[model samples]
Target: MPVELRANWSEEDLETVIRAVYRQVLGNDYVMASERLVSAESLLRNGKITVREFVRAVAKSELYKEKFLYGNFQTRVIELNYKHLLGRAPYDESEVIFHLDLYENEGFDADIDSYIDSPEYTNSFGDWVVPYYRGLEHHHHHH
Candidate 1:
């Protein structure tokens, strides 16, 4: 006698399996929210979800922010640049992959320091830092 295993599943069977996996990892509420995000054409057109949605989903759900945050944020910005340059997101994944691989190899600290030295980064940092310093002053005054 030989042992045998059943492997084939119908489309409905596959959907059932997928649903089961989602339930196990994300629970009912998260799965429901994810369905909304997936079905939103505006989000799809943007090539990534909005920051507000990303923050809410990660904060309310068991999902890992660090896992999805940078790629999704970067994708939206990169897609915007691509649309400006070519009137569409670049159809070639290789081009995007190459830049992503290059940046991943370069690491975040160096990128942040380099960005901060740029005029745009300097202005943005100053805008945030002013409010941060004001908060610090208030804290010290209270203490």
Candidate 2:
């Protein structure tokens, strides 16, 4: 079952959220100490930030940019973004096109912002919930 983390989570739960975010968003088994977003983690630990904000920090981090964004195909990047941040695939071509267009017009940051700032994100993860693989049944609509 998905762990629906809340704002008033315990230290162990915070650790869980951190690990989940790193794995899901960064696609890494472990975050190097040097590469870890210490300040962002601090904020989350102290209750100054929500899990969504922590996720935003990670997604926009130099680490993620270097690994996933830079030197990769934009189309592939957006697809991965949806998978990583939204916890699901791009449901349709228009969903993919929308992000591609966002990146083209508004630049890279906006493209990243769209996912974390989206209503879909809010409805799914809310302020404190760590994102996880969702809408599993959507996968059943095989082409």
Best by lDDT: 2
lDDT of 1 by residue, 1-143 (tens): 21111244355643442332222344645545344434332442343532223323323344333343455675554444333222235457774665456458774323223322345423543321211211112245555
How would you encode candidate 2's per-residue C-alpha lDDT over 19-118 as one tens digit per residue?
7776443435444534568899888788887667787887776545565567888878888888777777876799878888888898778877787778
Per-residue error for 87 in candidate 2, Å, reads 0.5
In model 2, the Cα lDDT at residue 102 comes to 83
Model 2 pairs whose backbones collide = none
Task: lDDT for model 1, please.
Answer: 0.36
